[PDB]
Design a protein around this ligand. Structure first.
Ligand SMILES: [Zn+2]
Ligand SMILES: [Zn+2]
Lengths: 977, 100, 50, 50, 50
């Protein structure tokens, strides 16, 4: 048909595929690439930051009435709220299909128009993915101290980076926020007869400038203005309170309560920042921009001694992924070309078949460009060109073997079975298109790239290729085993059935997981400290931990983040550390251990550390795990109910129980035990007898101890706060606070201990609520075992060996298990449906109804090697492995089609099978040896497609081993009976 | 942001600059300029090509609100329109009335 | 047509509150500011709805 | 080009001038422009809009 | 200024300008199958330019 008009097009079609190749190049160049695809489903958080409030106060008086509004939001999937000291954090994760800015507008519509009595203004966190951390930088200097570095961060580095297109915000960590401060003794306020209310209502009475509009003199108008704005620390001392504010206790620089403390190698205190890309923006480009920005800072904007340098960069992961995938695919192409050169005699011809490889890819890139399909280098890691090139094989086998005039005839003869074989392959990838969410967002471009390559393969195998112009002992041995296939149908069905039961036994018992760990270039650490710890002590424990990590030759820079960032994104207390461990290049390691083994070594090492429990993650996967269900972990056990102590008890029981089960590895109770509080309970009776308003006491507490800013000072473009605070030991303890004074209606200083009863009681550190219900969480990561097997052995012992209930407290599970199960169900729904469609496709070509049955039931022959590989290699059955089975089944049923199409009763079978031996063995060989180099372990971005490749290769070995023996025997057993 | 009587330097200092600080990270922004002067601060933002209108204005709106606002000034986005979009220019004319 | 765009700086009467003298006579800077705010240029005390 | 049916003018005056004086400047600009037989209307906007 | 558009467009066409004349070359080569001839007919472009 087209192969007729093709020959005289020899010049034209060449230019066609050439310019098309160029358009494919431009397609790739304009095709945004992703090393680590965005895993996390659409979600957003509302951050209400209340200055001084305790955890309980935040939860009850802020978080809950916010929950009442947020609860009925459109597209709501799960709504959780963590309320910690000075912070109310509401994480809302939405359903599948809700876009970002939409749901953002919805939450924004909910959280506005609320009350929030403390002046708390709820706000949505930056719009970014949990994988959004790209440039993590620390600005360093060998002279300048922390405060100067902090100023440089705030007023130089932050805005400059924030200008970068693609960057939503840059989160600030550590450092010192500078404020103008007044340090004075209450004995002095009792000395000069001044109330604590008066001094603050004074210092903040006047800070301002005033426009006086326009004053007319002659024909020239003059703007009337005036300046009362305090420009410095000295201007503060002169506020009237002839007693000066400076004659009153000293006026100096200071900082508010530190929300977080950061450290790096041998550096207990420093400052860093975290660049957040905006949502769906391609990381590498935004990284080019931020690279330009950073170098613009270091070379130009920042002082000579201060230089911003990153401890974490996404472009590095990108480059490592690029190198690994590049080397892999290059090796694949080389092996295909090599084996092609080995089977096919003529080298030039082998090249003619070889040019099918780059062209069909360039065919696909044009489509992926116009369909806006991104290129995930990890999923595109498995292609192997043992599918795409098969179409070029069967014709080349057809032509050449037919020769040793008009080639279009035999090309036409082989045109029908290969085209339907092509459709069979592309329809076999239907279940990949079927599944949704994470696994889709991961594997999607592979299925499209292959399918579009299949269409591009036919374009090469027809409009180009035909228009281009030890086996000796393998032959009779094959005739010998086909000769053994005569009759013996009982022993033959013995073999077939034994193989079926084989994959049954081997398949039924095996590990069932979700994803193969998706290695990154670092390690994230979740550390929990003792309850009620000061920032200083937390920083010291962080120092010791960080120093214990640096002991390892594999680590490079250990960054420890104590508490939470100044932005309010993380609901972390001072009792919590997040440690970023950046490993050296894997080749530089002088210790033999693999990353997992290093993980175990670090774990066992940290077990010898005082007051520290360390869970293990990687930064991005940690983010998406956090967004997934309850916490940062592979799995969680949630204990519901409104009683904190009760849920605490049961959660301790389950916490201790999970440590018994082999699968579970890192087990923590999550929310820290309650911390010591000094509780001031105002007695209104005594307040009535002494004539004291509660507002006075509350103000004394907030401004006296806390130092909530009284006014705001403006200096140049910069601004700071101004705070009047009791000095040092003024409050060291309950007794001192009791002896503090405030005014009265009768004009006499009264100690608050005469009115407000001061006691000591512990209270919850962080209150977590899932869907308007209070609960606690047991965080657990599992390592060294299977997920499904672990929930098999555990999850029973929880419902058996753990006594609970009476009043409320019901348990529950969460983490990646629910995700894996959803994917499993979604796969098993579309799985039988595609079997039926491929059953009609097989019924279309042969139209005997026997061949569809036989060929479609040739699949378990392929399943064998898929299972023996995953068992022998020690791998696990998962999404990637499942995909492996998909592709494997595709090439298996294709090879069955090709074999049977060409298939003296049993002699017809022997000769018929013999004729088709070469292209079957060849296509099998190239398809296996295609994904063989992708089974090479070492690399970054290396393991996604590794199990895919394993299943494909092993499965293909056994599929081909069986199909050249069992298949024609079964054929002979049916068609002759 | 229109605040009457306030001088130029104070308009830049206490109004324009913080508003700019909260605006800057705005999604898909091309160039932001600001002119600060007696009576008001005008912050103009042009967006990278291919940006929807109500989208952009929703972003700007999502930024400017919830800020300092010393003098009671209330930042508000100018009417959605185009430089070529003033289609009618009229005058009120009467012999028998006055400007009030 | 070539100009400097933004015009040269205008004359202004600058009222700078002296902190020391404000301490000596006991005056809040707020009093003075609001004096040149409400008193001189003027600020609306309230709104009348007819 | 791409001319419309009109001519627009960007005018800068002495710095910090009174709005009344600038009003008079506008008046002289209009009066001087109207001397052209080709112009039907000359509209001056001094200051800004509301 | 306005040149921001100019330098954007001047390069813009310059990217796709040879691209279409290379595509036109493909077409002309398609029907005639000659090499010299579509080159000669492609030489008609500067003739009109004058
Ligand atoms: Zn985080
Ligand atoms: Zn910010």
């Amino acid at each position: 048909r087209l192969v007729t008009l093709c020959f005289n097009r020899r010049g034209i079609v060449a230019l066609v595929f050439a310019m098309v190749a160029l358009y494919g190049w431009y397609a790739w160049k304009q095709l945004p690439l992703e090393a680590y695809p965005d895993i996390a489903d659409t979600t957003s958080q509302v951050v209400t930051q209340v200055n001084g409030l305790a955890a309980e106060e935040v939860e009850q008086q802020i978080t809950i009435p916010l929950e009442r509004e947020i609860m009925g939001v459109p597209g709501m999937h799960v709504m959780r709220s963590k309320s910690t000291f000075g912070l109310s954090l509401i994480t809302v994760v939405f359903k599948d299909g809700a876009e970002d800015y939409w749901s953002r507008q919805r939450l924004q519509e909910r959280i506005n128009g609320v009350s929030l009595p403390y002046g708390a203004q709820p706000s949505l966190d930056p719009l970014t993915s949990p994988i959004g951390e790209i440039y993590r930088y620390t600005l360093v200097s060998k002279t300048r101290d922390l405060r100067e570095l902090s100023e440089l961060q705030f007023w130089k580095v932050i805005p400059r980076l924030k200008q970068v297109a693609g960057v939503v915000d840059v989160a600030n960590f550590g450092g010192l926020t500078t404020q103008f401060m007044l340090e004075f003794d209450p004995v002095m306020l009792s000395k000069y007869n001044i109330s604590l209310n008066q001094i603050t209502q004074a210092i903040s009475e006047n800070n301002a400038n005033a426009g006086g509009s326009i004053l007319n003199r002659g024909e020239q108008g003059l703007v009337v203005r005036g300046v009362g704005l305090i420009r410095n620390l000295d201007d503060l001392g002169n506020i009237v309170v002839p007693v000066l504010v400076k004659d009153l206790g000293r006026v100096v620089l200071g900082n508010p309560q530190r929300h977080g403390i950061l450290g790096m190698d041998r550096n207990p205190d420093t400052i860093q920042g975290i660049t957040l890309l905006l949502k769906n923006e391609n990381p590498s480009v935004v990284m080019e921009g931020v690279h330009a920005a950073v170098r613009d800072l270091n070379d130009n904007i920042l002082p000579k001694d201060v230089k911003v340098v990153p401890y974490i960069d996404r472009s590095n992961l990108v480059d490592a992924t690029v190198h690994t995938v590049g080397k892999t695919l290059m090796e694949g192409m080389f092996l295909v070309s090599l084996v092609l050169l080995l089977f096919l005699g003529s080298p030039r011809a082998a090249i003619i078949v070889a040019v099918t490889i780059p062209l069909s890819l360039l065919m696909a890139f044009i489509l992926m460009h116009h369909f806006k399909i991104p290129a995930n280098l990890l999923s595109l890691g498995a292609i192997d060109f043992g599918i795409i090139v098969d179409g070029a094989i069967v014709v080349m086998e057809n032509i050449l073997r037919r020769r040793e005039r008009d080639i279009m005839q035999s090309v036409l003869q082989v045109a029908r079975p290969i085209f339907f074989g092509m459709i069979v392959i592309i329809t076999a990838y239907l279940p990949l298109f079927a599944f949704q969410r994470i696994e889709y967002k991961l594997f999607s471009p592979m299925a499209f790239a292959v399918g579009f390559a299949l269409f591009g393969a036919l374009l090469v195998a027809l409009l180009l290729i035909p228009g281009l112009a030890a086996l000796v002992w393998l032959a009779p041995r094959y005739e010998s085993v086909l000769n053994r296939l005569v009759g013996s149908t009982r022993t033959a069905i013995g073999i077939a059935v034994a193989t079926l039961v084989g994959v049954m036994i081997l398949g039924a018992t095996i590990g069932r997981d979700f994803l193969p760990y998706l290695d990154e270039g670092s390690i994230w650490l979740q550390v929990t400290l003792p309850p009620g710890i000061s920032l200083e002590k937390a920083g010291q424990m962080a120092d010791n931990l960080r120093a214990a990590t640096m002991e390892f030759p594999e680590v490079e820079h250990v960054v420890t983040q104590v508490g939470r960032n100044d932005e309010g994104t993380d609901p972390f207390s001072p009792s919590h550390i997040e440690t970023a461990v950046t490993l050296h290049p894997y080749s530089t390691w002088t210790s033999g251990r693999d990353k997992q083994q290093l993980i175990e070594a670090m774990a066992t090492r940290f077990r010898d550390l005082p007051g520290t429990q360390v869970g293990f993650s990687q930064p991005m996967i940690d983010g998406v795990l956090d967004k997934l269900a309850g916490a940062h972990s592979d799995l969680v056990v949630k204990v519901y109910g409104n009683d904190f102590a009760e849920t605490r008890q049961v959660a301790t029981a389950i916490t201790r129980l999970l440590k018994t089960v082999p699968g579970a590895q890192d087990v923590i109770i999550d929310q820290e035990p309650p911390l010591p509080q000094v509780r001031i309970d105002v007695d209104r009776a005594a307040a009535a007898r002494l004539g004291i308003n509660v507002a006075d006491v509350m103000a004394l507490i907030q401004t006296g101890i806390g130092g909530s800013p009284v006014t705001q000072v403006f200096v140049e473009d910069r601004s700071y706060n101004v705070v009047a605070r009791f000095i040092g030991s003024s409050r060291n303890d309950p007794e001192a606070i009791g002896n503090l004074t405030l005014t009265a209606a009768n004009g006499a200083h009264v100690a608050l201990a005469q009115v407000a009863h001061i006691r000591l009681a512990e209270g919850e550190t962080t209150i977590t609520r899932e869907m308007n219900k209070r609960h606690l969480t047991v965080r657990l990561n599992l390592r060294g075992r299977d997920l499904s097997t672990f929930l098999e052995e555990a999850r029973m012992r929880i419902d058996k060996e753990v006594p609970y209930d009476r009043t409320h407290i019901q348990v529950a599970w969460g983490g990646q298990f629910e995700n894996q199960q959803r994917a499993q169900a979604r796969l098993a729904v579309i799985l039988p449906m595609v079997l039926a469609l491929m059953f009609v496709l097989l019924f279309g070509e042969f139209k005997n109804l026997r061949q569809p049955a036989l060929i479609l039931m040739a699949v378990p022959l392929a399943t064998l090697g898929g299972l023996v590989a995953l068992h022998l290699r020690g791998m696990t059955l998962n999404v990637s492995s499942a995909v492996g089975f998909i592709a494997l089944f595709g090439v298996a049923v294709l090879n069955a089609i090709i074999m049977i199409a060409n298939l003296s009763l049993k002699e017809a079978v022997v000769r018929g099978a013999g004729e088709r031996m070469r292209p079957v063995l060849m296509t099998a060989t190239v398809a296996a040896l295609g994904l063989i180099p992708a089974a090479l372990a070492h690399g970054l971005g290396s393991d996604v497609q590794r199990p895919l490749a394993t299943v494909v290769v092993g499965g293909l070995i056994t599929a081909t081993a069986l199909t050249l023996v069992l298949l024609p025997a079964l054929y002979y057993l049916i068609e002759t009976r």
